[PDB]
């Protein structure tokens, strides 16, 4: 299946941009893929979630119907060569719409170590 | 806006490269590469870096459709990726069969690429 | 200066061919009537000059057309038709192409239109 | 990139004159050139009739830069030779100043610019003393 | 004479598998039975080589002493019946070794119709 | 044309075509090479070889004075896609000829996946009285 | 390579100021600029300032080009601060149209422009 | 009178060209003008020449049939704000042309506080 | 066939053996190179060790040497107080494949026969 | 301290030259003066020593009381500009001496890239 | 670190030349010289060829500094380059005012070269 | 400057080629060259040559225009360490030819102490 991705301001790096397009398009399998063998999601207040396998399972219940609207991003290369990544924009599901900021951090190889998400908002929690 | 999968082909960075140069994201395609990286267009000589890539597509890569059919990708000993990508180009004028080679580094970036048509005896 | 085409002495012909391989191409669109329309042979169809201009801007970057020989004819409405047959090499593909032109009785391009021909031809 | 404005000029529908005008507003000095005979000259309004296109792409190439003309109407006529005079009249701007002009042409019986010449029209000059 | 016949990634067209098997063992007369009467070798410097004839003299003598080491390549079947092949690797010659592209175009009868070879940038900077 | 490729009477496949002009000429790994890189060669009184390098060592050391006649054969096209081809023919060695049935099974890409021989009734077992 | 032409202008003998118009005259843009302070300012007609040698230079690379200056009087006098303030009054011609112009220069202690001004004398 | 003046590469500076402007059309009074009070012209071989005043006498009467001809120079400005000039050329006369090397000091004001010409040749 | 041998002219070499090393080396013709040699002459090729003699020097370049075209471009030749002669001689060596860069080095006895050669190329780490 | 510069039959290159008269003179900083900042000496046997600062380092303790004798040589000139150094002779240090050829290879700015050495003969 | 830059000039042979000196090198700076080369110093006679030139350096120029500030060059038609180099050489005695004279042949190596002192502090009264 | 000889059978001796493939070329100072100081060439009919100086000159008008053809010779080594040469061909002029045995003594230097020449025939 071919999928589609608006181009995130700031961002080129592949891989990021693969995140959102796979993930929007239900491709939990090819999303769960860009994390290397230990790479670890964590969701929104749920614990994380560790491993391509578990990440794909945990994306093909619960991330179904969200759709990720990435707006911004900047990326930083760190000393030990992984880099760094934020983003910032909206999700929206079925129920309402949230403002967001996903972190990533990336391997030599741009393999997804690890990624957080935050939602941008103050004690409504 | 625009990622179509390439029969055999799963790398981020291949994949994108076909997306940009399918917009108008002729620097959104440039920094794909390496900042040393070298992009052979067919007859012309190497280009290098992001900077003159852009500027190339800029002028002559508009118009132009890239359509990969098919690819593979396999890793050197040196950690980096060899891609070929087989397909047509489509331009205004003409449909061309083509071969696109590319090497990426082992961040993934495009430390060269080049395009062979397919094609016998034409000449210049 | 402007090279012949055996067969054509219409200068409006003359000076189509011309313009696009030097490559100036506001010289190219202002041959054509404010109405007048550039097909393309896989694209819509390019109304006015302003247009074909822009057009001409980003495709037709790298292109020599190699007109060989034509004929003309002047129809009952005053209108001029024009067949020009010949090679288009780009730095993809090389084909053999015969520009089919409309000139009004002012000698402006009321449309003009590219067909390909063969080479790719073995069969059985 | 240059963004390419084709101007369309009233009664005037000769492609030689609509390619002049075209061409020296982008600044194809070469295009505008080639529109002339072997043996045509320009003659700018102040200096001396220039011979040739090599010559009149040298002149344009460096005179001629940042000028828009802009052609408002126009007449033409076919001589007894074959050969087309064309009055077209508007204005010349440059970033320092405009005026309003007259520029002449006379084409040969392959349309080709024998000789152009231009002509300056009284702009507020008050006689009125 | 120990003869060592490499799989080659995407590649399971017998007539190339033979031209590499054939070529990396010496049996020249072999590689060139491959080709169609009128089957054109282009060498990556000299001119076209035509028939198996003449492209069994040519192995003769230069090919002596040559590794291909094919690596990996794609194939395409034209509506003609064809078949288009991309392979892509290196050959050694313990003078110098480059990186090569191999290009084939089999005809309905799986007999080579023509093979170019085109190199490949190694490091050529500035 | 100096180089020979025979054909074989109701054999169009060009991989079996290639096995005998192959085997004929001595080229054991252009006949090796044929085979997948699973594919079994079963001669006819030893075990099965496996893989175009083994099939070329074994060709190497048994096969040198070997000349196969294939007369004719058929082939027909399993539900799998595979090949199956019958080739008869005559077989001699410097110390014996005798009568012979080629099988072979190709995978979709035309491989050889595996081959036999089968001995056939020779002129003297006719000679049964 | 341009020769250069050092009109004499009168009243006016400060080798900078004639170098201004002497440099303007060859096509030697980036001549005329270096005579400005690092920090000084070109004010030409209706733009806004430009402050330094390399912008001037730039500014007058693809603004100034086809321009006779024309300086026929000027004068000067020096302030208490050590600065000249020159007036040079006179024409500057197109190949289209001439104006009648003042220009207006400061110099500083070292000969050098920290700013100039053109003022055209008409009332359009 | 209008002074003629082929560019020097690398060279703007308005005092240098002034001077091989107004030597080359004779002006010997305007040359000897771009010197300080001060300031002092080494010709080749013979001694110092100091002032305006005796600049001019001494072209007057010695430089009238040279056309100097610099081709190139450089300019640098050092820390008690003078400004240092190298300028190679051609200095031809009727009979015959040598490479030459002018150097100049200007004061911070750009008038020219020493100048030296050397020939290059080796006799 | 006799071959044709093209005695190509290399700049500042005029010894007529080393001009014919060349020559007879590109008509194939090794055991005419091999003749150049002393009896005790000694060929070494590059990365391989010393080979001893005509004999062994004919053997060698007849299955190693095919399909190589030598192309010296220029060379230097000096003689020592024992009477020897050395000449360097720098250019390229061509196969079907791919060229290198190539200084041979050569030793010549009072009798003009290569007493030894060793090649050595010109690239690489 | 007695310097001797002997002249290398075939070489005039003066980077040449010079990395030989220093070496010979113990004046170890300037040799290493000679290469690009990015320049690497092989010696041989030992791994590649880059920068001048490590092959001065080097030369200053390993390559004492070391006299190359070089006799002869050739240069050659790249497309890239880059120069091509083969020179030949003896190095002796008493106790024992062998032949050697010193490789060279020069930027544009004839400074040295890399130098490798190879020894030759009298083993067998 | 080492090798300054001199305003105007990029010729090796002159950057060496002055790198050279300033260090102790006079074997470095004796080398630039051909082999009929000459140093003409300003108050002596020529000093011909680098093991002469190398000599003259070891017993005067030790201990002195040049520094150059500025240079030319030219490129005649014999196609040999012409340097002049100006600025001061400064010794424990005194310092100087200097303009650097060389000659390069076709392979910059130097032909010659000759200093000119310039003016310095002499007032005329 | 390049010359060529067609191989001659038995023969490997360098002098011998370079005799042969000089004559062809007209490169008769070269010829003369392969001779000793005080080396010999009796050509048929005439007196000994002595020289090189002596043979060069005779070379140059009457060899003129001479293709000598060796087609097959033997070398030997006597006990002086001298070469005894013996090669026999055609020597072809644009109207005729004739069958030729040429012999040649070589020194321990490979340089000709004497050429001899000899028609083989029974005519005239």
Excluded: R
């Amino acid at each position: 299946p071919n999928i589609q991705i608006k181009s995130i301001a700031g961002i080129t790096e592949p891989t990021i941009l693969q995140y959102f397009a796979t993930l929007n398009a239900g491709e939990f399998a090819a999303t769960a893929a860009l994390f290397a063998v230990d790479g670890v999601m964590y969701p929104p207040f749920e614990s994380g979630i560790v491993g391509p396998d578990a990440i794909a399972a945990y994306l093909q219940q619960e991330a179904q119907g969200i759709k990720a609207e990435p707006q911004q991003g900047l990326a930083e290369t760190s000393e030990d060569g992984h880099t760094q990544v934020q983003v910032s924009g909206k999700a929206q599901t079925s129920w309402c719409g949230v403002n967001v900021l996903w972190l990533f951090t990336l391997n030599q190889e741009k393999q997804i170590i690890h990624t957080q998400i935050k939602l941008l908002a103050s004690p409504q929690e």
